[PDB]
Amino acid sequence: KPELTEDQKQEIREAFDLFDADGTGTIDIKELKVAMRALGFEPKKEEIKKMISEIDKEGTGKMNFSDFLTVMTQKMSEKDTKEEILKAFKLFDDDETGKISFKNLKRVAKELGENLTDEELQEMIDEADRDGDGEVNEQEFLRIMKK
Amino acid sequence: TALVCDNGSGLCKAGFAGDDAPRAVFPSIVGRPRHQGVMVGMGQKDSYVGDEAQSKRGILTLKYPIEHGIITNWDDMEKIWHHSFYNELRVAPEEHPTLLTEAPLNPKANREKMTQIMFETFNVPAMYVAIQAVLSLYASGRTTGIVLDSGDGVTHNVPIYEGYALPHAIMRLDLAGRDLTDYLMKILTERGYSFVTTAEREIVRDIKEKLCYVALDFENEMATAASSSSLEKSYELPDGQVITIGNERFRCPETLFQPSFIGMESAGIHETTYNSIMKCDIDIRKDLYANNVLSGGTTMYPGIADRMQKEITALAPSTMKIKIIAPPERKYSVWIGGSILASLSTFQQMWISKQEYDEAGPSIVHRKCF
């Protein structure tokens, strides 16, 4: 079942509370849509009314924080079209080789902040290098990650 | 619309709610003309109150109302409020809900009496009570804070948590601006300026505002002052005599940390605040270390923020980010808090009000209020 870290919850909390200083603990579904497109996704009116139907049987027009968080978690959870996968690899690779060197991974790790060890990084490289060429192509990245 | 009136014992402040500053300020003094038969012959009003009373201070009688932060006489305080409303505020008091403020731990009877006098005599339909530190934290803008407050007649520390005061950890210390003026007067007398009259004493107060500042490393500062004239700062009295002050400028503030100079034995303000948070609970201790906020006149002295930061850190375990904050307007900040508080529409729903005031009446200031 989808989950995200307590620090991710804290960040989402700051997002919610800045989204309106009015301290209501509930905010407009329209602003939820503005949030999603600020993340980079502009869902269509069918998805707008679908999510509204989730949030607001009563029709306040408002998520509470737990709805905001749970719908965020779900929309975070699913798989993307290839464009976003390419974006991911292009950020992972700034050697511009189409290869995730161990350097590329290690910098991405230092950027995100999780301190996972060098053998663990090299092992997820090794399994992610689905063709075993020495590191992971964007092809090999696709091949593992689409699974 | 709403009114806010406040008394850090030293001076009292009168303002319209939501304004970024109060509309008048005037000093916490009342005076009656010494021959009542002359007054009734004149029709000249019951009392001079506020600064014009000072202008006449010698021609009449003068008295203080809120000594050590506590009501010495109700009738005087109501005369203060009357003068405030008509002379400063002009509004009809009957037409504007009104906020009045008190020192903490006020003996229960005083709250009830104060309510009764305001509601019944002044005839406003609704009124609310607040404890000064609580409003000053509102001005700082936290529900979660340990406040230092010092209006020239008293000083307190107050922990407040999510908008309530944990009573037992409150402490009083009877060491405030008046005491500081008296100690400064003593030590200048040792220099040989020998201020004693009320007028001179006011001059001393002005010197406190002009030239005091805390030392950091007090013993080092004192040594450097002894070493050289370069620390001197000079001032000229209203009579045109020039007076010169060294070590004394920071030495006088030291009494706050160093009450043995006053010959009183409770540990200095920093210690008292530490001991208060020690009365508070480790659960909330971290946030208390996170928000140390300074309130009231004595905070006027330059640099005190750094001195507190050091001395608290030393007395604290060296395992938190201590943070002093000295909001620039900190003495007014008590009133600023009330102004914003009353501005909050929901407080209209908090209002104690005439209909309740009959049956629920005097007791609800205990029962309903905070």
């Binding site: 307590e6 919850k9 909390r13 509370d17 200083a21 009015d22 301290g23 209501t24 603990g25 509930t26 306040t60 408002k62 509470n64 924080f65 737990s66 968080l69 | 303002g15 939501g18 304004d19 970024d20 500053a21 109060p22 509309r23 008048a24 300020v25 509102y138 001005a139 700082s140 803008g141 936290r142 529900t143 948590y161 999510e162 908008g163 309530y164 944990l166 009573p167 037992h168 909001p327 620039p328 307007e329 007014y332 600023i336 808090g337 914003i340 508080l341 501005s343 909050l344 929901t346 407080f347 729903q349 908090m350 205990h366 029962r367 309903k368 905070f370």
Partner: protein, 308 residues
């Protein structure tokens, strides 16, 4: 007043015709250059906004709840954990009965009556606060800890603990002072000194009527009262235990106040313990009071021991 303004106009107009008369005074005003006092610039609008954002006071329902629990405390704070009042002397067993009864009564009152009352009253007010931070109908411990609601509840916990702490202190202090007013007369002066032989006469008297009534028996190699007094000292220390421990047993508010999820491992409230120094020194004082007062009974028995 109308005639005043007429008079002032007239005298202004024709001074010489009645020059002996004075004018009234004349006075001036200078516009305070701002109608508000100086108070150098600060983010007043931003501070106000921040205060509105953080605070919990934007919700009259929680106001009604909190004021209600305050009222409950406000009768609670003037209850007593002990019968700090007795009409006249009493025998030991009656002390034990009436104090143990008092303790049981207050324990039932707190655990059943006070907690249930405050819980249902606040719930009733909370009931109709709908979705938002204040949601009774919480479904995640994490979000509850995130919420203002938990912080408010923890403040309720703080207030009701604080109040019962005051009740404990005021009961203990009053009770000890009440014993003190009886014992202090004998506490002044004993030092193993025998009160005399004036069998009808005693210097040791309570300021009021005595606490205790005492039965005297005379025996082969004995003069003694009732049971040797220390048995009373221990029992009264246990009376302290019964009352102070009675403070502990208040169920932690969270588990009754919030129902819509599992919570367990619930504590009690905190209460003032048995070793907070002010209580320990009251226990010392009452130890002195009884132990020393028992000695003049020795002195009186000493003179009876010849008649024995």
């Amino acid at each position: 007043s109308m005639n005043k303004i007429n008079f002032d106009q007239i005298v202004s107009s024709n001074p010489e015709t009645f020059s002996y008369v004075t004018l009234p005074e004349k006075e001036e005003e200078k516009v305070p250059n701002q109608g508000l006092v100086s108070v150098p610039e600060y983010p007043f609008r931003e501070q106000k906004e921040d205060f509105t954002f953080v605070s919990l006071l934007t919700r009259p329902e929680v106001i009604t709840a909190l004021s209600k629990v305050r009222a409950e405390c406000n009768k609670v704070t003037s209850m007593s954990l002990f019968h700090s009042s007795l009409s006249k002397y009493s025998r030991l067993e009656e002390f034990e009965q009436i104090q143990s009864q008092t303790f049981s009564q207050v324990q039932m009152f707190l655990k059943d009556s006070w907690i249930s009352t405050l819980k249902v009253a606040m719930r009733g007010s909370l009931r109709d606060m709908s979705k938002g931070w204040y949601n009774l109908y919480e479904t995640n411990w994490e979000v509850y800890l995130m919420s203002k609601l938990r912080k408010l509840m923890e403040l309720i916990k703080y207030m009701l603990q604080d109040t019962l702490r005051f009740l404990v202190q005021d009961s203990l202090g009053s009770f000890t002072q009440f014993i003190g007013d009886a014992c202090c007369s004998v506490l002044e002066c004993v030092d193993d000194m025998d009160w005399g032989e004036d069998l009808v006469n005693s210097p040791y008297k309570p300021r009021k009527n005595p606490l205790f009534i005492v039965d005297l028996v005379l025996d082969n190699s004995g003069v003694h009262y009732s049971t040797p007094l220390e048995h009373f000292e221990m029992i009264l220390l246990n009376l302290f235990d019964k009352g102070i421990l009675a403070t502990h047993a208040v169920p932690q508010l969270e588990k009754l106040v919030m129902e819509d999820i599992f919570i367990s491992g619930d504590p009690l409230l905190e209460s003032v313990g048995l070793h907070e120094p002010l209580v320990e020194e009251l226990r010392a004082n009452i130890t002195n009071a009884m132990h020393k007062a028992m000695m003049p009974l020795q002195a009186y028995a000493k003179e009876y021991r010849k008649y024995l």
